[PDB]
Amino acid sequence: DNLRHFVQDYAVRALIPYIEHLVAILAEGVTAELQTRKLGDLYFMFGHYNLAFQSYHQAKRDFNADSAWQYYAGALEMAALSAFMLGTAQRKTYDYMEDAIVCYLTVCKLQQFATRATLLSMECLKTARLYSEVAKQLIRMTNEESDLRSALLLEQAAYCFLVTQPPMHRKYAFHIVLAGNRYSRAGQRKHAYRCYRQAYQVFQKREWSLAEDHIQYTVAKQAYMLKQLEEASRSFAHLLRPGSLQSAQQQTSFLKEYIQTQNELVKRS
Amino acid sequence: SQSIVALLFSEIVQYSQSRVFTVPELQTRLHDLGQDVGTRIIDLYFVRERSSKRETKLTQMLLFVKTTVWKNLFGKEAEKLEHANDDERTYYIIEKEPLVNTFISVPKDKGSLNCANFTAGIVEAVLTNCGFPCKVTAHWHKGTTYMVKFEDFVIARDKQMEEK
Amino acid sequence: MSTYYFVIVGQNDNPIYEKEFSTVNKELRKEDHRHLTQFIAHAALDLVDEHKWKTANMQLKSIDRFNQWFVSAFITASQIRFIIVHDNKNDEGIKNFFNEMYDTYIKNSMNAFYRINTPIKSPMFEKKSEIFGRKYLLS
Numbered sequence: 001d002n003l004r005h006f007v008q009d010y011a012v013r014a015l016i017p018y019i020e021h022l023v024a025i026l027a028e029g030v031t032a033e034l035q036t037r038k039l040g041d042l043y044f045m046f047g048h049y050n051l052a053f054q055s056y057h058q059a060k061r062d063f064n065a066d067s068a069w070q071y072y073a074g075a076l077e078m079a080a081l082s083a084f085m086l087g088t089a090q091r092k093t094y095d096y097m098e099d100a101i102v103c104y105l106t107v108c109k110l111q112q113f114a115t116r117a118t119l120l121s122m123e124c125l126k127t128a129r130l131y132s133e134v135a136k137q138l139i140r141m142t143n144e145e146s147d148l149r150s151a152l153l154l155e156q157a158a159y160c161f162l163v164t165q166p167p168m169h170r171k172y173a174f175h176i177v178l179a180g181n182r183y184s185r186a187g188q189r190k191h192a193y194r195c196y197r198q199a200y201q202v203f204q205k206r207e208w209s210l211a212e213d214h215i216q217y218t219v220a221k222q223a224y225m226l227k228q229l230e231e232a233s234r235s236f237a238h239l240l241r242p243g244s245l246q247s248a249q250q251q252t253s254f255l256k257e258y259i260q261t262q263n264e265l266v267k268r269s
Numbered sequence: 270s271q272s273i274v275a276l277l278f279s280e281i282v283q284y285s286q287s288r289v290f291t292v293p294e295l296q297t298r299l300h301d302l303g304q305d306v307g308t309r310i311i312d313l314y315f316v317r318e319r320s321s322k323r324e325t326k327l328t329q330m331l332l333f334v335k336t337t338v339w340k341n342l343f344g345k346e347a348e349k350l351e352h353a354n355d356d357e358r359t360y361y362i363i364e365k366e367p368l369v370n371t372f373i374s375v376p377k378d379k380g381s382l383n384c385a386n387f388t389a390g391i392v393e394a395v396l397t398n399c400g401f402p403c404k405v406t407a408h409w410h411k412g413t414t415y416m417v418k419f420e421d422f423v424i425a426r427d428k429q430m431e432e433k
Numbered sequence: 434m435s436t437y438y439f440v441i442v443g444q445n446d447n448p449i450y451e452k453e454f455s456t457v458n459k460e461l462r463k464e465d466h467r468h469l470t471q472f473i474a475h476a477a478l479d480l481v482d483e484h485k486w487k488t489a490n491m492q493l494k495s496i497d498r499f500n501q502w503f504v505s506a507f508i509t510a511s512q513i514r515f516i517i518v519h520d521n522k523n524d525e526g527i528k529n530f531f532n533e534m535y536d537t538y539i540k541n542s543m544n545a546f547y548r549i550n551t552p553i554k555s556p557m558f559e560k561k562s563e564i565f566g567r568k569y570l571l572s
Contacts, residue, residue, distance in 0.1 A: 143500070168479040174472050208475075211468045247464070308549055309542035315510040316539075321532070323510060325489045398444065400512050426486065 019046055033062050037071055044078055052082030073104040073113060077120055084124070091128065097121050101137060111145045115153075122160060135161035142175075148186040151179035155195055169202045176202075177215050196222075213239045217253055224260055233261040275372035282384065296382040303390025311395045314338060327401060327419075327427050328352070334395055335362055342388075343368050358424045362392070363414040382407055389415050435503075435519035437570035438467075439562075440474045442514035443550035448474055450553040452562045454517075454571035470518050473497060473504055477516050481506045492528050507531040513538070517570070526569050537561045 026039045040055035048055075059075035080097045083089035101117045118138055125134040138157030142150055158172045176199045183192030200219070203212045213235060220232035236257040239246065246254070281302060289295040315321060318337040324330035332350055339346040347364035367374075369384030377383070385407035392415055393405035404418040419427070437454035448471050455463075480496050485508045497504040503522050507515040515531055541547045541558055553559070566572075 168476075170472055170475040170479065174469075211472065214468075305545065305548070309539070309545075312510045312539055312542060316536075319510075321491065321510075323489045323491070323508075325486070398511060430486070 033059075033066060033071060036062075037074065040075070040078060044081060047081065047085065049082065049085050052078060052085075056082065067107075069104055069107040070110075070113065073100060073107070073117065076100050077117055080120055080124055084127070089124075089127075094121070094124060094128070094133075097124065098133065098137060101141075111149075114141060114145070115149075126163070129164075131160060131164040135164060139171075147182045151182035151187065151195075152191065154179040155198075159198075167206075169206065173199060173202050174211075177218075209235065209238055220257065220260060224256075229260040229264045233257060233264060271371075278384065278387075279372060282387075292380050292382070295380075296386045299382070299384065299386040300390035300393070303387040303392075304394040307391035307394030308398060310338065310342075310391060311398045314341060325430065327424075330399055330401070331360070331362075331396075331417075334392070334399075338391070338395065339364065342391075343371065357428070358419040358421060360417050360419070361414050362417065363411055365412050367413045369413075377409075385409075385413055385415075392417070435521040435523065435570075437517055437519045437523070437566075438470055439566075439570075440470060440516045440518075441553075442474045442478050442516065444512055445550055446475070446478055447550060449550060452566060454566040470516075473499070473502070473518060474514070474516050477504055477506050478514055481508060481514060492524075492531065494524055495522060509535060509538075511538070511542075519570075523570065530565065530569050534562070534565060537565075 022042060026043055029035055029039045036055065036058060040052075040059065043051060056075055056079040059072055063069060063072035063075065076093075076096055077100060079093060080100075083093050097117070098121060101114055101121065104117070105114045118134070118141055121134045122131075122138065125131055135157065138153070138160055142153035142157045144150065145153070154175045158176050162169060162172055176195060180192065180195045180199060183195045187195075200215075203215070216232055216235035219227060219235065220229070223229050223232050236254050239254075241251060241254060282299065285298040285302075286295055289298060314337045318341070319333060324333055335350050336346045343366065345366055347362055347366075349363045350360070351363070352360040367385065368388050372384075374383050389405040389407040393403060396403040396405065396417065401423050402420050403423070406416045406418075408414045408416050410416075434456060436456065439452040439454065441449035441451070443449045451467065451470075453463075459466075476497055481493055484493050484496060484506075491508060493506045493508060495503050495505045501520055502518045503520065505517040505519065505522065505524060505527065507527075509515070515534065517527065537558060541553070541555065544555070547553075547555070
């Protein structure tokens with residue numbers, strides 16, 4: 001009840017003395033490189049605005065050496081954090097941030113660094129409306145690092161690529177179903193299912209039933225057991241084998257579609 | 270020759286008049302035929318005159334079309350190309366020589382528009398295939414003129430390009 | 434070698450006509466790759482829109498990449514898009530090879546029977562495609 005916020009306000013305004021103690025501790029610290037980055041990120045928990053820039057600078061200079069570049073990587077992303085409390089944000093620093101991923105990706109194969117580096121890129125460029133860049137570097141990320149992480153990152157990068165402009169859903173659609181397979185493979189069901197649904201809706205928005213027909217044969221395999229049959233039935237019906245140049249397996253497939261629509265007709269009649 | 274083309278085109282016009290029961294969509298047929306001819310006129314005259322060179326500047330492409338299409342179709346390039354400052358979507362190309370009245374035409378009492386619309390449809394097809402979709406209307410203003418109305422999308426792309 | 438494959442993207446963005454120039458193999462998988470490359474034709478379409486707004490020339494060397502394929506895009510006064518997917522580029526000849534198929538497409542243009550984005554059906558253009566592909570790309 002009220003006691004929580006009472007102790008909360010008192011503890012916050014006693015931590016202001018505590019953060020002052022830590023400021024004294026770091027002013028003592030300036031008098032190792034790991035000590036420097038501990039200094040940085042500790043006062044970044046309450047986020048020093050310019051000491052951000054000086055930690056940025058010092059970390060860059062020294063961690064040119066000491067080729068364990070998590071120091072320097074984390075340094076420039078906390079420089080991006082500074083850019084959040086920096087109106088100019090020296091927007092080329094964002095370019096620096098892009099730099100951050102591509103080289104440091106290769107520096108260490110601990111992919112999580114690449115992940116949240118790209119995520120900070122995502123958010124900060126969303127603070128610039130120019131999502132195109134992070135769209136491209138997220139799509140160049142998502143091919144790799146997994147077949148599962150590849151999938152949810154495929155849709156992340158995908159909808160993000162669509163964040164800048166509504167149309168050109170094309171490669172969006174392609175890789176999001178070519179990852180919806182992996183979604184059915186190793187993903188929590190609600191996210192994979194929202195994959196399938198949003199992908200299919202994006203299909204219908206600008207129809208192009210050619211590859212949608214085979215992905216709707218997949219809709220059917222999840223409809224021959226779980227989903228509704230009529231959607232697959234009408235999907236194959238609009239393909240309409242003669243004049244659509246279907247193939248031997250496709251004719252057999254629409255035989256099976258006749259089987260499913262037979263189930264549907266029998267259940268209706 | 271001139272008599273053969275002038276006549277034969279006249280039979281296009283009047284056979285449309287046969288299949289058409291009124292003025293306006295008769296003029297629409299004339300527009301459609303102008304389109305169906307310009308749809309290749311464009312990329313024929315591209316190579317032989319524009320030296321196979323694209324003109325992203327609406328002014329430059331429009332001026333060059335003004336020179337070329339009229340130079341080869343009807344000999345004399347149209348007199349003047351103008352842009353209206355009030356509406357950047359709407360410009361004018363005035364051609365004092367009537368290409369309809371080259372074959373001296375019908376009394377415009379029972380009708381209003383003529384082969385002017387056909388060449389207007391030619392212009393419109395050229396525009397829409399040059400990447401500048403537009404509406405081209407034949408107008409008996411200061412004699413023969415073609416009013417061109419640019420899509421706000423197209424003129425917007427142009428204005429953004431006209432931010433050097 | 435490069436599995437050259439040509440595709441047409443129309444004025445109204447609908448695809449028109451393809452032409453393989455690849456060696457003979459993996460044709461069942463090549464059907465799926467043909468679906469893929471029609472999708473790549475759309476993706477090209479999208480990118481080459483702004484990229485041709487960047488320039489004013491006929492040829493835009495190569496735009497899209499898929500870790501094995503290269504995408505080469507040709508824009509015309511007809512605002513058609515002529516696209517090649519190919520593992521290793523051959524651009525130096527295909528500039529004027531696109532120019533020659535351009536001239537042939539003009540020949541089809543004078544055929545008023547062929548019309549706006551009206552899909553190719555003439556044997557003349559098909560045999561021209563065959564001879565030209567055996568000339569440079571399929572070779």
